[PDB]
Design an enzyme around this catalytic site. Structure first.
Site, mmCIF file in Angstrom:
data_model
loop_
_atom_site.group_PDB
_atom_site.id
_atom_site.type_symbol
_atom_site.label_atom_id
_atom_site.label_comp_id
_atom_site.label_asym_id
_atom_site.label_seq_id
_atom_site.Cartn_x
_atom_site.Cartn_y
_atom_site.Cartn_z
ATOM 1 N N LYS B 181 46.776 47.322 3.753
ATOM 2 C CA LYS B 181 47.100 47.753 5.102
ATOM 3 C C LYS B 181 48.462 48.422 5.099
ATOM 4 O O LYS B 181 49.394 47.937 4.459
ATOM 5 C CB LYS B 181 47.136 46.567 6.083
ATOM 6 C CG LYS B 181 45.809 46.043 6.604
ATOM 7 C CD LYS B 181 44.897 47.127 7.125
ATOM 8 C CE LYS B 181 44.596 46.924 8.585
ATOM 9 N NZ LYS B 181 43.456 47.745 9.034
ATOM 10 N N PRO B 529 3.840 -12.925 19.679
ATOM 11 C CA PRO B 529 3.667 -12.643 21.108
ATOM 12 C C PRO B 529 3.891 -11.172 21.415
ATOM 13 O O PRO B 529 4.861 -10.564 20.961
ATOM 14 C CB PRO B 529 4.725 -13.530 21.768
ATOM 15 C CG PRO B 529 4.948 -14.627 20.810
ATOM 16 C CD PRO B 529 4.772 -14.040 19.449
#
Ligand SMILES: [Mg+2]
Ligand SMILES: [Mg+2]
Ligand SMILES: [Mg+2]
Ligand SMILES: [Mg+2]
Ligand SMILES: [Mn+2]
Ligand SMILES: [Mn+2]
Ligand SMILES: [Zn+2]
Ligand SMILES: [Zn+2]
Lengths: 827, 827
Positions: B181, B529
């Site tokens: 850059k 149960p």
RNA sequence: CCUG
RNA sequence: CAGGAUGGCCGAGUGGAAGGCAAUGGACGUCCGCGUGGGUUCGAACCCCACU
């Protein structure tokens, strides 16, 4: 054209001269920039779709350059991702620029089959109306589109008119269903021809719509084309032919063509005709309409080819071994376990054979393996034959290296230097890599480096660092793909893997079956031929020990045959005895009793059944375990066995899945049990043989079944010797072989005549079935081998005194062979 | 700032004045065009992420206009597809333009949960390095990237220097790890601040790299920045602050910051300091780095809100009824079956009650329903209460219409006109639609219209045609979503769906259990149960008929209690008798015997087990089936039962998964079973109760468990009558209720005491347990009701004469209640 | 979208 | 396969908004604006891509 370079262990496409660097590529003309781009993208697509490879392009400069933004973007559009590094890696050396391509999708059954498409493409040629625009479906979009198609208005008011006024304003805009078009007077007709292919498929693929030619796009005025320049009937013909020319594909019946309505209407100015307006209504098409063939590329043979429309659709919608795929991790852990800190050689037996046969091979390999501290080296007589290639004389052995910080290397050892050696090694490495990807399903970056070696005292392409196996994860994933590939070919390692697959299947069935221990005390286990009955019996005895906490010497196993008890007793999981020893001696201290092959028992000596009932019932922790395994298909005599009636043998567990013989032997057993069903012995209760193997069940293991009728005894015996020698050369051990004859009286004769031919093949030890722990072949009768099994079995001349017993013999023989069965019948 | 318009049964966002049309949007300034686009896109993203809705725009022109290509392309980028039609549909009338949005992802557990992201976004703010470019990750890319992060060089030679020369050429190009850059000419510190977020995130997200600021991008020359222009230390401070300002999200320990090395190096010029160069080496970051907060929007309450970084990442990286989702198809076909060719009212009991209570309601509803020829109309007292909202006095009922060729409509019926009525209906319809999508997981286009009706004397939007239910598939998918929505709330239909879920669970456990019919003849079934023992017993006799091809009368069922005997008999699946009848009458015509609640049998009358064995094992088709169902936790007395000793009871099955009681009731049952195990009854054989329930098993069915201790008899009875009246008002039938008492002698006393309060509540009929088909509240003792079930159970004053049975009686009481259990213990 |  | 689209109008400008008929695009010295949307660039009317 584009062609694969053949001198490499990989797919390498040479695309030629290419301008690289963004500054350099900006100076090209658009035509040349686009043509170079198209060559490179054809190569990258082909390598993505064909298992990966290398693109080689000559670069016109010497210094390092970047790829160029347009090439970058085309690669991104190819993989539908900005993650180029995942699939593309570039190296350049001198005037050469390489792109290394990874495969897009790997294997026949990838994890992502329903998630990501099979192919990469340059274009799918599938267009969708996307509101007021027409857009091309990328690979993912087209994948979803076809996956959906495979499953089982004011505009119409305008269309109904039979004439239009010049300058008329249509009251609706362009929309998902409407598209207005206008053209210049001279070119109107050619513009229509080029227009139909881009708008008709888009409407058809999406829901239909109306295409108005002769309407100003902005003002929506009706203009048409002047009468002098347009023939309505010729225009209709041209449009209809363009429409029907469109390539359509179907996932349905009936496969009707594209449905549309074409109207050529009159444009009236001041009440007089001025020109013609063309209106197409496109109904939604049942399936996919392409504007042309897709632009997708693959490598076949040696040419980079383009996929046809139908082949592309097939690939985008739709021996491979799924048992291998399913068990790959367990199989890799068993056979190709990765050592933590040294280089492993496998198979150890084959390695020892090779070093004994060839002097200096040990030193050669040890010197060649100095750099590789950790990994595995997999030997073979010829990896080429292991992969269904042609053998090459002079090849001492091949070795595949899989080590850390290194790529896979396929070594070929030659006795003396050869010109064809490097070509042979390259073909083998190329085939190995292509299988590791396309069959073994490896999704990483893989290369196999071909390296020839000579025992008697083109550069290699350098791959990115990402192609080296960095450690345990990569090495294990690659070795699991190798497992899956090996299971697709016949070889020593594929046979070891097949045996371990059979063991894993048996373990699955045993986990299903062992849940009955807590639910039963008395159990009659009716197994089928090759159902693992004996393996379940042993594992059940171990489970009894673990669960009831009783010591091993408190668990008793009863069988008819001395070899079987000997085999069971050597396990040290229980006390094992024979029916006669059981009936004679006292066992009051025994709590749990397991009885196997009960259908072979006999009532002469006494009531073994009542004895066992008593012994088990008088156990302290309630009644003990009394499990009687039996198989009526494998009956060995016509007398009663002392078993209770069929209606009394309850509760029952049936082992019906065949898990102990490979696929061919399993099919043979399935067929042959029908003979026993047709004519059973009278000691067998009628309803028992109404048990059938599971129709949905297969082993997925390869095997060899050979019937060799019409041969004499000496020919049989020489053939047996030749086959055993071939197996021992390939690397099998003698303890994987057994020879089975009719009766124990013929055992001595057949032993003598087998040794007569074996003394020509360098092994002179034949053992009876009563010993199974030494490394020697076993010769014995079919019946004395009951309950035992070997990988390779030779079946010689079935024979028995009574027709009522003969049918069983083939089953009781074929069920003894795990993988390889050779039958020598009378004729 | 955008706000939801509150007068609508949908999410409606008014974005204001928008220029529409390509020719009109081309005349704008770019700033205005982009601002309008941003407003519309925020609205669309919010509606996608919030369940869908409508965007309202005011269009500046009278005539119809296309949206505009920039808006189209923004929507395409939003959904990452060109299939806008699937999510966006547009309508317009006059000066109003509507975009109807479909939800992006719907439901708590989508089908695509692991493949597609949960959110749509305008930008993810996640950047990756792609060779020599920085690219933003779309939703799908960011989803995959975050998944990967969540799961558990020549450049360095230049970087090592401490000075450079102006005009120096760097010998390497830009690559995946290098970026060149130049400095800006104008505002240097501001430029560096701008550029750091553009490149540091991409390097950190994609393996690190180098950013050289001050190096010409094309010639690779070092230029730097003039000495007078920037100050190196201030520049370093600015760079470091910009880097540390970058948002980061961690999926790991530790949460370390971004790692980097920042160097400012003098740029000499002929040996004299001319300027500076900035070199940043960005190390790879363990997790995601954002350049700024993601640009994603959602509707929170009345506001359109942006999601924070962490909220967005959580959404992207990842009551509700799992069983509702799993069975939605079966549940829908049971309760919400949609008939062909007529409108169905449900629930019919509630519909009948409503029309009886209110004059002319039938006329009103039938008048309203004329337009619809098919579908289902679902009534409720207050759909608002069903959906957990507040009730509105004056509301007779709410009906939800789901009919062909129509959108869903919620009707609210008022006695008298009301201003708040339309608001109430609209709020309910909005809640229902949002639930259907976000909770019921509907993936189609859904809207719920809200209509108010009266029994005494803002216009709704017009949705696209695709929002109307086209036919069976749409109606069924919507009703299946409604099933899941209802199963998350407490209401009558939710309780019916919960009952059917329990039935589906029982059927699954029975499919597992019924495999033992082929394998056993004598079986002792030990149920816990709530494990569905009697349901299994009935269903297995149904199976015995089909599998033994005998007529029904050949099967015998024997139990202890007359109410259970009756309940079984009235199904006509077999002959059913009592132990006492069994031990007397002739039953040798029977083949098969099933014995239930055998733990409650008694010896004093005879050898019932011996008689059962004798009858069964003398059948013609071999010994018959003799299965004995018993439950030691549900022992009713301490004497001898006549069963064989526990050590003899084999083969044995166990039903350990509770499939008949809602989740609270089941948990209460387990807690009481723990007490039983801690202090077991002595008459039970020693090891019986060491059965344990499935640890991870759950029903996913909501229920009521309430223990009202220390009440008086008057308070108990009044509360029972009051709760009964509440249920009956809500729509429950009387035959869903059972009132149970500790002993049978108290039955008539409590019958009087109940009617004393119930006659105030407008129901007059009670019944003994011997009639379970009558539409009456059953009052009876726990003992007589053993083996029977009802949705609502009132347990009164449980207790035992003999202390041991004290917890057993509580278990036998609780196990009778399917969904709602109210207990009134002793003070 | 326009022109050759 | 080529060549186009510039401010009110005619038209000059292919990488540091002429002229002609005192100014004569806009948001807040920065930014956007040369058909629209993007990209590269320190810098785009100017180069690249898509679209119209
Ligand atoms: Mg001009
Ligand atoms: Mg110009
Ligand atoms: Mg522009
Ligand atoms: Mg500009
Ligand atoms: Mn058009
Ligand atoms: Mn750059
Ligand atoms: Zn079709
Ligand atoms: Zn982290």
């Amino acid at each position: 054209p584009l062609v694969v370079e053949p001198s490499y262990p990989d797919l390498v496409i040479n695309v030629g001269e290419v301008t690289l660097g963004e500054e350099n590529r900006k100076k090209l003309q658009k035509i040349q920039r686009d043509q170079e781009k198209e060559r490179v993208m054809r190569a990258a697509c082909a390598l993505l779709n064909s298992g990966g490879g290398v693109i080689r392009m000559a670069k016109k400069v010497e210094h390092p350059v970047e790829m160029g933004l347009d090439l970058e973007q085309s690669l991104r559009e190819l993989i539908q991702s900005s993650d180029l590094q995942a699939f593309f890696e570039t190296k350049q050396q001198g005037r050469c620029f390489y792109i290394f391509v990874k495969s897009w999708s790997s294997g026949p059954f990838p994890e992502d089959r329903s998630v990501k498409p099979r192919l990469c493409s340059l274009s799918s040629s599938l267009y969708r109306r996307s509101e007021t625009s027409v857009r091309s479906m990328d690979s993912r979009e087209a994948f979803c589109f076809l996956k959906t198609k495979r499953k089982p208005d004011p505009a119409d008011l305008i269309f109904q008119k039979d004439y239009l006024e010049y300058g008329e304003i249509l009251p609706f805009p362009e929309s998902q269903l409407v598209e207005f078009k206008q053209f210049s007077t001279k070119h109107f007709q050619e513009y229509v021809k080029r227009t139909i292919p881009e708008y008709v498929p888009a409407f058809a693929n999406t829901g239909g719509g109306y295409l108005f030619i002769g309407v100003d796009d902005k003002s929506r005025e009706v203009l048409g084309c002047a009468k002098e320049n347009v023939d309505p009937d010729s225009l209709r013909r041209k449009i209809e032919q363009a429409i029907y020319k469109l390539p359509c594909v179907h996932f349905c019946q009936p496969q009707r063509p594209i449905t549309f309505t074409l109207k050529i209407v009159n444009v009236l100015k001041r009440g007089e005709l001025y020109g013609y307006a063309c209106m197409i209504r496109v109904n939604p098409f049942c399936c996919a309409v392409f504007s042309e063939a897709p632009n997708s590329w693959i490598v076949e043979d040696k040419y980079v080819c383009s996929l046809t429309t139908e082949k592309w659709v097939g690939m985008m919608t739709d021996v491979y071994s799924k048992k291998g795929l399913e068990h790959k991790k367990e199989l890799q852990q068993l056979l190709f376990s990765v050592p933590p800190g040294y280089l492993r050689y496998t198979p150890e037996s084959l390695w020892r054979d090779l070093i004994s046969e060839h002097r200096g091979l040990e030193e050669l390999i040890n010197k060649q393996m100095q750099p590789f501290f950790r990994g595995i080296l997999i030997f073979s007589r010829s990896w080429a034959v292991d992969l269904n290639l042609q053998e090459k004389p002079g090849v001492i052995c091949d070795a595949l290296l899989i080590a850390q910080n290194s790529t896979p290397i396929l070594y070929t050892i030659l006795r003396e230097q050869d010109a064809e050696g490097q070509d042979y090694c390259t073909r083998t490495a190329f085939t190995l890599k292509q299988k590791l990807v396309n069959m073994g399903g490896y999704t990483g970056k893989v290369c196999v480096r071909a390296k020839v070696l000579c025992l008697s005292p083109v550069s290699p392409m350098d791959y990115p660092a990402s192609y080296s196996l960095a450690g345990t994860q990569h090495m294990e994933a690659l070795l699991q793909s190798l497992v899956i590939v090996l299971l697709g070919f016949r070889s020593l390692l594929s046979d070891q893997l097949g045996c371990e697959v059979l063991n894993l299947l048996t373990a699955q069935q045993y986990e299903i079956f062992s849940r009955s221990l807590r639910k039963n005390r008395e159990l009659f286990v009716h197994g089928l031929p090759g159902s693992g009955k004996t393996i379940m019996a042993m594992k059940i005895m171990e489970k009894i020990r673990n669960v009831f906490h009783c010591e091993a010497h408190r668990i008793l196993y009863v069988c008819e045959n001395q070899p079987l008890r000997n085999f069971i007793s050597d396990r040290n999981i229980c006390r094992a005895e024979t029916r006669k020893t059981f009936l004679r001696e006292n066992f009051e201290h025994i709590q749990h009793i397991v009885i196997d092959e009960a259908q072979n028992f006999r009532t002469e000596d006494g009531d073994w059944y009542g004895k066992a009932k008593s012994i088990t019932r008088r156990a302290k922790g309630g009644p003990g375990i009394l499990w009687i395994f039996l198989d009526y298909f494998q009956t060995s005599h016509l007398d009663c066995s002392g078993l209770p009636p069929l209606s009394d043998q309850y509760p029952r567990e049936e082992l019906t899945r065949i898990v102990r013989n490979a696929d061919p032997i399993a099919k043979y057993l399935q067929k042959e049990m029908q003979v026993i069903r047709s004519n059973p012995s009278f000691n067998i209760p009628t309803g028992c043989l109404e048990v059938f193997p599971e129709a949905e069940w297969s082993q997925g293991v390869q095997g060899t079944l050979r019937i060799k009728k019409y041969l004499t005894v000496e020919q049989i015996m020489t053939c047996v010797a030749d086959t055993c020698r071939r197996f021992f050369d390939r690397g099998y051990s003698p303890k994987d072989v057994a020879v089975l004859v009719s009766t124990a009286k013929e055992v001595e004769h057949y032993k003598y005549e087998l040794l007569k031919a074996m003394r020509k093949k360098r092994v002179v030890q034949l053992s009876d079935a009563c010993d199974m722990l030494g490394d020697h072949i076993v010769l014995d009768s079919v019946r004395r081998f009951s309950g035992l099994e070997r990988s390779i079995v030779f079946g010689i001349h079935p024979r028995t005194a009574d027709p009522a017993i003969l049918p069983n013999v083939l089953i009781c023989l074929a069920s003894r062979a795990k993988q390889h069965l050779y039958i020598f019948p009378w004729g």
